[PDB]
């Protein structure tokens, strides 16, 4: 199913939808030490359309193939936008034209910014740029805002804004879109320049269900899981929960069961052929008990055993006994 | 065969007898693989040690990748070598007791009193017990004659990381690890107990490596990236 869209020559044709792990270039490799697949798999998260396909000959004489895939990004909730003054922020919500508060002339905002962002940050240049952009759109004359020398000054800009037909202080009468009722106060309107940053929420999501683990540590990574870590462990300790710590640090990662000999304490194994437990040191004569531990602890025990350190695990009754 | 909890861990030095008994094979072959790529028996990548490829039976236990704890091997060193991690401890053992008999260079009555005090408070006051142990070690290093033998004792100096130099006549001589192992083996168990160590769990001669354990394949898996050639762990 993954080779459906691959052309006969082995490279995907332009202007085709590429979803998930579709292959773009089909390559077979002979072994270094019988063909093997080194074909390109499109990144699992990324979905897009093939834009361009390029075929060339390298200097040494090898065939070089490049495939460029385009993906359309429509702004959404969580996308990061920033002005020319240092006011970075995600999109809280997308509001329809009907819901946005319209003015007497019917002009609705493209972006609404909380006034409380202004006084602590002390960015007066943003309001100055809003007024300047309003004046530039109204009068049509160029606005120069070079530091220490601006043409025209603020007062002439306000006077011309009043002359063109709007309020001198760049505010204007605003009616609530949802209810139709005029606001008790005027609202400042401007044309501040905004830029869309490349920290989109589309590629910033990392979520993991049950999946693969490492061959050595038997812990989940690559989609990889979020590391819990010491500080979150201490937060969980601080709340006093015990089964939650056990779930978050033992059940969902490197959950293992190991059979331990009673006498020497070294880790044994269960033999599938014969139901009897087997101890590496004691052979068959000793009894072995199963204990559920993190596989990381077993790895630590075996790494200490690769040293001359000899950790002997001491078993105890699971019940409180008493 | 009942599920149990872990009360604790008993730490100790792994004796050569335990290494030989626990190991499933003796590694004698230098080569790791063959010309065709099949692993060679008796080598570093012995299939007896463990299995990492899914769907492969382990010869020792018969389990798949999941359920195989990994089985240790062992290599017999021709000449004993000093474990780096224990050099300080070995150092503390060399200068405290004489080479002639291995007894602590302290009068017998004082040894009895110190042993009684330590045994009384080895567990109640670990800090006070450690202070007593360091005082005994200091007074043993200070004395340069064995009360039991009378043999003259030579100052032993440790040049980092593992070089031991003994002042014989007017010249320094390098202490061979075999001679150090003999000196440590001559030390009695009670004297080791007095020095803060546990004679049953750990013995000074076990700090000198006669047999070296070979870790299982499970903890040093051979990872083969698809683009690259087979890669082996640094271990």
């Amino acid at each position: 199913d993954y080779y459906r869209l691959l052309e006969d020559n082995g490279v995907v044709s332009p202007e085709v939808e590429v979803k998930g792990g579709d292959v773009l270039i089909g390559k077979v490799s002979p072994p270094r030490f019988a063909k093997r697949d080194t074909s390109i798999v499109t990144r699992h998260g990324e979905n897009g359309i093939v834009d361009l396909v390029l075929i060339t000959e390298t200097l040494e004489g090898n065939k070089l193939v490049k495939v460029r895939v385009r993906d359309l990004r429509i702004p959404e909730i969580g996308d990061k936008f920033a002005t020319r003054h240092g006011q970075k922020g995600v999109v809280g919500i997308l509001i329809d034209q009907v819901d946005m508060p319209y003015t007497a002339k019917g002009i609705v905002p493209d972006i609404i910014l909380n006034p409380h962002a202004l006084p602590s940050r002390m960015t007066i240049g943003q309001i100055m740029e809003a007024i300047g952009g309003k004046y530039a759109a109204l009068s049509g004359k160029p606005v120069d805002a070079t530091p220490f020398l601006e043409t025209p000054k603020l007062q002439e800009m306000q006077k011309e804004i009043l002359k063109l037909g709007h309020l001198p202080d760049s505010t204007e009468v605003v009616y609530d879109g949802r209810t139709g009722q005029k606001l008790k106060s005027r609202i400042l309107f401007g044309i501040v320049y905004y830029q869309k940053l490349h920290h989109m929420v589309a590629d910033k999501m990392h979520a993991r269900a049950r999946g693969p683990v490492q061959i050595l540590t038997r812990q989940p990574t690559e989609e990889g899981g979020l590391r819990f870590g010491e500080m979150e462990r201490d937060c969980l300790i601080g709340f006093g929960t015990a089964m939650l710590i056990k779930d978050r640090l033992l059940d969902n990662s490197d959950k293992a069961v190991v059979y331990i000999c009673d006498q020497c304490g070294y880790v044994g194994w269960y033999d599938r052929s014969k139901n009897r437990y087997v101890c590496p040191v004691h052979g068959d004569k000793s009894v072995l008990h199963p204990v559920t531990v993190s596989y990381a602890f077993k790895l630590l025990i075996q790494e200490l055993m690769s040293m001359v350190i000899s950790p002997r695990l001491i078993l105890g009754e699971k019940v409180n006994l008493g | 065969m009942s599920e149990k909890i872990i009360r604790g861990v008993k730490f100790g030095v792994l004796s050569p007898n335990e290494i030989r008994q626990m190991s499933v094979t003796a590694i004698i072959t230098s080569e790791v693989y063959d010309e065709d790529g099949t692993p060679i028996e008796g080598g570093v990548m012995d299939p007896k040690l463990g299995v990492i490829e899914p769907g492969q039976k382990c010869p020792v236990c018969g389990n798949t990748l999941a359920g195989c704890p990994g089985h240790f091997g062992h290599i017999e060193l021709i000449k004993p070598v000093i474990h780096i991690g224990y050099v300080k401890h070995i150092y503390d053992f060399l200068r405290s007791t004489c080479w002639r008999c291995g007894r602590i260079k302290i009068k017998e009555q004082d040894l009895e009193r110190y042993k009684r005090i330590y045994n009384a408070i080895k567990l109640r006051w670990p800090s006070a017990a450690r202070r007593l142990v360091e005082y005994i070690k200091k007074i043993s290093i200070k004395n340069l004659e064995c009360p039991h033998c009378g043999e003259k004792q030579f100052k032993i100096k440790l040049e980092k990381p593992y070089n031991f130099n003994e002042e014989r006549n007017g010249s320094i001589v390098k202490l061979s690890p075999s001679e150090i192992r003999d000196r440590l083996e001559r030390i009695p168990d009670s004297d080791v107990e007095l020095l803060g160590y546990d004679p049953k769990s750990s013995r000074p001669e076990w700090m000198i490596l006669t047999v070296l354990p070979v870790p299982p394949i499970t903890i040093r898996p051979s990872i083969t990236i698809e683009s690259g050639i087979r890669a082996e762990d640094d271990l």
Partner: peptide, 27 residues
């Protein structure tokens, strides 16, 4: 979970073993 400790153990009565197994079969 299964800790077995035998206290004041008594010998198995061979004559009464038949009665005991009959009682067990009745149960």
């Amino acid at each position: 979970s299964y800790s077995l400790k035998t206290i004041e153990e008594h010998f198995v009565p061979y004559s009464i073993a038949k009665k005991y197994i009959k009682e067990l079969i009745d149960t």
